[PDB]
Amino acid sequence: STGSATTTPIDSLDDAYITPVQIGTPAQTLNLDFDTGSSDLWVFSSETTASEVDGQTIYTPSKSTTAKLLSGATWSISYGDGSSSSGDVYTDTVSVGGLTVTGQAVESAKKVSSSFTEDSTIDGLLGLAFSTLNTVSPTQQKTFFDNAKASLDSPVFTADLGYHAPGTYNFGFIDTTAYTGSITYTAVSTKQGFWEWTSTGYAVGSGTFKSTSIDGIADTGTTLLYLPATVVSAYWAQVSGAKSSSSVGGYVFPCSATLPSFTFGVGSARIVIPGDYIDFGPISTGSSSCFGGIQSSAGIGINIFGDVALKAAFVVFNGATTPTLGFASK
Numbered sequence: 001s002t003g004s005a006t007t008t009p010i011d012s013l014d015d016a017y018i019t020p021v022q023i024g025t026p027a028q029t030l031n032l033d034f035d036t037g038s039s040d041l042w043v044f045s046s047e048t049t050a051s052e053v054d055g056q057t058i059y060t061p062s063k064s065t066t067a068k069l070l071s072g073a074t075w076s077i078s079y080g081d082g083s084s085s086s087g088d089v090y091t092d093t094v095s096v097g098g099l100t101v102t103g104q105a106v107e108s109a110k111k112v113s114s115s116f117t118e119d120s121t122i123d124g125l126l127g128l129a130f131s132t133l134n135t136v137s138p139t140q141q142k143t144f145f146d147n148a149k150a151s152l153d154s155p156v157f158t159a160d161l162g163y164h165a166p167g168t169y170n171f172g173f174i175d176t177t178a179y180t181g182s183i184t185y186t187a188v189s190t191k192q193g194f195w196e197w198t199s200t201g202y203a204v205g206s207g208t209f210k211s212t213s214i215d216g217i218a219d220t221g222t223t224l225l226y227l228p229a230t231v232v233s234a235y236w237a238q239v240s241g242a243k244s245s246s247s248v249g250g251y252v253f254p255c256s257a258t259l260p261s262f263t264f265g266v267g268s269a270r271i272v273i274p275g276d277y278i279d280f281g282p283i284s285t286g287s288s289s290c291f292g293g294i295q296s297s298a299g300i301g302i303n304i305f306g307d308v309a310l311k312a313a314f315v316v317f318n319g320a321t322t323p324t325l326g327f328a329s330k
Helices: 144-151 229-236
Strands: 004-010 017-021 028-035 041-043 068-078 083-095 101-114 124-127 156-160 166-169 184-187 196-203 211-216 225-227 243-245 250-254 261-268 269-273 280-281 287-291 294-296 301-303 314-318 325-330
Touching: 004 083, 028 041, 068 101, 101 144, 184 196, 196 229, 211 225, 229 250, 229 294, 250 294, 301 314
Parallel strands: 028 124, 041 101, 211 301, 225 294
Antiparallel strands: 004 017, 004 166, 017 028, 017 083, 041 124, 068 083, 083 101, 156 166, 156 314, 184 325, 196 211, 196 261, 225 301, 243 250, 250 287, 261 269, 280 287, 314 325
16 A cells, blocks of 8 residues: 655745545544654644643544543653643554554644644644554553555655745655655664664765764654754854854854755755755844844753755665665655
């Protein structure tokens, strides 16, 4: 089997992407944030504290003839950005782009943090990291991909995120028309539960490539590119007037600037992030200070190849017995 679904930016900055997902019988379609940095499929629901729901579409398990309470199971998750959610668990039928999994754990939120409430466009998350990170207790549950894997034509999914435009998540096949040149594959460590890999270096604009190992995670659920402070300083030093602002929470730059590109290495291959992908616009409405899309990972504890990086590539998440990651230009 295979599946193919369009993923759409939630706003004009590509702060996140939503993908429609069918849950239950009859189908209830929710728009979920596919997150290769976590491993829970959780939704706003009829059980979510009423004051914490503000415009989201909810899953109502009592209206699904295939929903079953997973007795005694609870979940609770905290994300890198400080947001969180928790609740209980149902199993139900879940379909993405024509690919159906029966008996998928659907984690129903009883509580969500303010950042989730305030984002009316995201109805929940669909985790695509390794199932070892799933938070369901006392019986850990499998991700949608892990459940689908054996049925897929090939045990892979791909992320093709757009810049200020829709893109595609495919399951079970590689669309050879969706990228240019060849796909370069690189080793993955699953030791921390992430799609963790080592970039071979970077360049700023038309500058020379610096060969240096940068360990990090491919994370579709993180907006920006978080890299070591040395790398990030070298980038912003090429933008007149750019500075790190502790009050704002990162590097800012004059909105009048033209940003240089940023290149990262994948083995001997190179992925080029155009300068415009690094512009996240005014820090507040009407400001001439703009927020940068490349930020320091210092004090995160891990480097994160988030959407800024991934949307410059066609990315293969290869879930074979020995997982790997592939990157192509597009």
